[PDB]
Design a protein around this ligand. Structure first.
Ligand code: HEM
Ligand code: HEM
Ligand SMILES: Cc1cc(N)nc(CCc2cc(CC[C@H]3COCCN3C)cc(F)c2F)c1
Ligand SMILES: Cc1cc(N)nc(CCc2cc(CC[C@H]3COCCN3C)cc(F)c2F)c1
Ligand SMILES: C[C@H](O)[C@H](O)[C@H]1CNc2nc(N)[nH]c(=O)c2N1
Ligand SMILES: C[C@H](O)[C@H](O)[C@H]1CNc2nc(N)[nH]c(=O)c2N1
Ligand SMILES: [Zn+2]
Lengths: 414, 416
């Protein structure tokens, strides 16, 4: 059936036909919705039998996308892929298909509010990599290219695909650039509390921790299933921003900084039945990712109390909304600081406005846009952004970015 | 479906285990391949047949007798037999007062979109199934309003009018909420009052209401009894408790002339108990501050005051990245909570309400085996991630007894 989505502020109604193309499951059933579950449901590798239909599906939509469906090039590619799955139990993507597949994995990422940019993605083919040193080189080049002296450029680097599940390429870092976290003797936590465990895996592997509040973690890189190896990203490649406030001259005295480059490195890229377990990708930040989640989550840097102190807010009762007041000022500071240093950043009003425009484009040219309201709506000021009022349909299209197990729970050491 | 489903809180790491979803009785709108969790709403004489009614009543009666620890008793079997004979001879049945009260409280308990459910067992149930006329409905509703308002010490309550029979004799409150402000569309395209209520205000004017044409005019009740044409009544103004909005720091905030009413009372939902349909069942609680301060005042299509407050705050309004909207939104919500607390009118901030809801949810998982919750509605419309519900995974499913949406009565009424 055709499904309708309505915006309750503008009364615009869009008609979704694209959902008819999905064949992967959401986790919901007719009687139970799992729309707020974060992850709904080494031997698990494909077979020649499961692989050819997935390959055929992907080749078909690629040749349909360049408007040469059923062409001679299309026929030959399908046959070519057939023989290769036969004689090798897998196949290799053409460069054009790799690029198309990575852009469409972004385009299909229902949790990403930034997708208006999906077709402007620089794709770095790293499928010839064999060692952790090679991975380090490729990642440095990615970081330098994507950072671009503050004029951030979206990029993805794609390492060799899974073969037997015993020779996986993995970036063990969850993001390329993150700050360490240290469990203190007295029980509290220095640095980023989200990374205490990963920080300790780096220390346990030989990393000498400076034990500061903003220590960039080393890279921990696993190539071809071997034990991971540590590398220090050269500091001149890591662009950082001191956080200050346009009105509160005391804000700089908090000593806060953050990095300019958000770069997810723990997801799996699926294209045509092939699995790329190492595919770091990076864009630029929406301000609330830093100012709301990173700084103000109770399990993260958790700075609301200090800022509200310096603002001299009444903190005895919640109904003073002292937390909400400090939250806004922290996010003003983040946006001001990146903008003052000419580092790309987008505020949640502009970002969600762009996403509504993006949805309009996709419904017109593509017949829909899968979208996860729970993730699209920003973590502050929700209903004064236009996505709060926008009905969204969530469904799974391939190529896609998927979650995968943490490497330290699966890797057999040597 | 699997027998145990787990939900995790990503801030505290608490895992809870849900078995109550096995009792879900109606459709969410989702399928295996598409999730409709952000969709807001996923014939008259089509009424329950005898064959449809028998099992729905048994399921409810079984549930009631299980709750009073009398499952399988002589009184349980006799009540089943009595109900079955009633459906046999009359095609319907009547609930006992105990069952009506249990059913209404559980429809609230089951309301997955409601963050206020820690209170569900403290609900005053007014049985109005003897009502026959719109004048009688007005009396019952006035009594409800006075009871629930309680001079500012608000008490949750529901008034239940006669159930549906053949669908041509429905009781309905045409108002979507018992207390709302009129909205007036002007020839130049602007709106005075509450823009959300323009359509209903026009209906009232057509029915004979003389509109004062102000910014905060309480709408009349438009009340339909036994399927008759609806009739207009003015709520006595001394029963409508109102709060002028001022700010603890900004002396100029009172000069905006804003006020709101104290009693949130939903009157357009259908209460379903054991297959019986109560099409007029107004229920009321107390406000969470963001319902007024974020939605009523700051939605672009409502009173839309962010600009005017931002101006009086002397904010930079040229770039969105100054977050002038967010800054003014917090101050408006501070004013709303301060004005209600100062006048001793019950209100709950979004921090306190979501923390209570988490405690309620954990208790329900422990004692009941789960708690259906709609994250999209439970998370407040401002400061989402600094409330504990943001990080709480939730399962949404539909249990009965339940509050359900129903068609707007002006779209279905057959005018006499
Ligand atoms: C270019 C600017 C971009 C912006 C402003 C942006 C914005 C966002 C935000 C705010 C989130 C939520 C993140 C979280 O809460 O953890 C997100 C998620 C996501 N983004 Fe984007 N993004 C951008 C680029 C990209 C790119 C280049 C890719 C891939 C090629 C991508 C793929 C994804 C995916 C897969 C998720 C889901 C993450 C998860 O499930 O944990 N994004 N994005
Ligand atoms: C006692 C204090 C209460 C509080 C603080 C509270 C809070 C809320 C809030 C904030 C909403 C969302 C409203 C919206 O965004 O439109 C809501 C929805 C709802 N509440 Fe509660 N509520 C309370 C009492 C009640 C009572 C007494 C009932 C029924 C007996 C009830 C049943 C519902 C239902 C069915 C919804 C969904 C409404 C819809 O879908 O439009 N609530 N509640
Ligand atoms: C390409 C891109 C652009 C953009 N603007 N943002 C992102 C996410 C970035 C990002 C996200 C996260 C979230 C990690 C955990 C937090 O707990 C909830 C589950 N979540 C997975 C951490 C980072 F350190 C980071 F950098 C990616
Ligand atoms: C019992 C109870 C307690 C409490 N705290 N809140 C409520 C909701 C009250 C309430 C809700 C609404 C929402 C109206 C429309 C707007 O379009 C989006 C969907 N929505 C249905 C309007 C009111 F005027 C009102 F008063 C009920
Ligand atoms: C499109 C979306 O479902 C819609 O805007 C919802 C979002 N969440 C909400 N949550 C509450 N409590 N009330 C609402 O009216 C809404 N609106
Ligand atoms: C429980 C819920 O699914 C979880 O807290 C989600 C809510 N929405 C989110 N939205 C974004 N963008 N990022 C997140 O990490 C989350 N967390
Ligand atoms: Zn769903």
């Amino acid at each position: 059936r055709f499904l309708k989505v309505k915006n309750w502020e503008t009364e615009v109604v869009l008609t979704d036909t694209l959902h008819l193309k999905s064949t992967l499951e959401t986790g919901c059933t007719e009687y139970i919705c799992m729309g707020s579950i974060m992850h709904p449901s080494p031997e698990d590798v494909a077979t020649k039998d499961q692989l050819f239909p997935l390959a055929k599906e992907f080749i078909d939509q690629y040749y349909s996308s360049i408007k040469r469906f059923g062409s001679k090039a299309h026929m030959e590619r399908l046959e070519e892929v057939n023989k290769e799955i036969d004689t090798t139990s897998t196949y290799q993507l053409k460069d054009t298909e790799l690029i198309y597949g990575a852009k469409h994995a972004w385009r299909n990422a229902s949790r990403c509010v930034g997708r208006i940019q999906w077709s402007k993605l620089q794709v770095f083919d790293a499928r010839d990599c064999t060692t952790a040193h090679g991975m380090f080189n490729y990642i440095c080049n990615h970081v330098k290219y994507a950072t671009n002296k503050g004029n951030l450029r979206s990029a993805i680097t794609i390492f060799p695909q899974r073969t037997d599940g015993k020779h996986d390429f993995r970036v063990w870092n969850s993001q390329l650039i993150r700050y360490a976290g240290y469990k203190q003797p007295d029980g509290s936590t220095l640095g980023d509390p989200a990374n205490v465990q990963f920080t300790e895996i780096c220390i346990q592997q030989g990393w000498k921790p400076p034990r500061g509040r903003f220590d960039v973690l080393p890279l921990l890189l696993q190539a071809n299933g071997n034990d991971p190896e540590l590398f220090q990203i050269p500091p001149e490649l890591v662009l950082e921003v001191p956080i200050r406030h346009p009105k509160f001259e005391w804000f700089k005295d908090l000593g806060l900084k953050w990095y300019g480059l958000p770069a997810v490195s723990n997801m799996l890229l699926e294209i045509g039945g092939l699995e790329f377990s190492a595919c770091p990708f990076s864009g630029w930040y929406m301000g609330t990712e830093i100012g709301v989640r990173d700084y103000c989550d109770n399990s993260r840097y958790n700075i609301l109390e200090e800022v509200a102190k310096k603002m001299n807010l009444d903190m005895r009762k919640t109904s003073s909304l002292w937390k909400d007041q400090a939250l806004v000022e922290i996010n003003i500071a983040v946006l001001y600081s990146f903008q003052s240093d000419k580092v790309t950043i987008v505020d949640h009003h502009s970002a969600t406005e762009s996403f509504i425009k993006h949805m309009e484009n996709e419904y017109r040219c593509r017949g829909g846009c899968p979208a996860d309201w729970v993730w699209i709506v920003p973590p502050m000021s929700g209903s004064i952004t236009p996505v709060f009022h926008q009905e969204m349909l969530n469904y799974r299209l391939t190529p896609s970015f998927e979650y995968q197990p943490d490497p330290w729970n699966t890797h057999v050491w040597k």
